[PDB]
Design a binder for this molecule. Structure first.
Ligand SMILES: CO[C@H]1O[C@H](CO)[C@@H](O)[C@H](O)[C@H]1NC(C)=O
Ligand SMILES: [Ca+2]
Length: 128
């Protein structure tokens, strides 16, 4: 069921999980919750999501609570500004330390509590 896009395969899950149980599932399939590093990747992802919410690899790191990618892609604060839903990350209830694709727009991301269950997206490199 993996979908191919620009050097990577993507798994859009059929069952919802917490952010971490999702990441564990991805790792068991030799992947990670997806990073997003271009406008074209964001578009591929939200279009494929078809209006449903999917955990991606966004999660907090460091004392300052900076956002990061679980697959260790450096997080670019400047280049990613255009990818959040206006008002996000708003850190609701001071307990939203993971990120998902929520809105069907380039401005797609929301921070939500890591312990809520959602469908999720894994990303796995193709290595020729
Ligand atoms: C009302 O709460 C929801 O909407 C806000 C944005 O208005 C979001 O910022 C907030 O994360 C989201 N909560 C959950 C649990 O998904
Ligand atoms: Ca939020």
């Amino acid at each position: 069921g993996w979908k191919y896009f620009k050097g990577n395969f993507y798994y859009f899950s059929l069952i919802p999980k917490t952010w971490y149980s999702a990441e564990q599932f991805c790792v068991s399939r030799n992947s990670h919750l997806t990073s997003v590093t271009s406008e074209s990747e964001q578009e591929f992802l939200y279009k494929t999501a078809g209006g449903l919410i999917y955990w991606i690899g966004l999660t907090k790191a460091g004392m300052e609570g900076d956002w990061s990618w679980v697959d260790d892609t450096p997080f670019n604060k400047v280049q990613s500004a255009r990818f959040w839903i206006p008002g996000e990350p708003n850190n609701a209830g001071n307990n939203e330390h993971c990120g998902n694709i929520k809105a069907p727009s380039l401005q797609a991301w929301n921070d939500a509590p890591c312990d809520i269950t959602f469908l999720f997206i894994c990303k796995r490199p193709y290595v020729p």
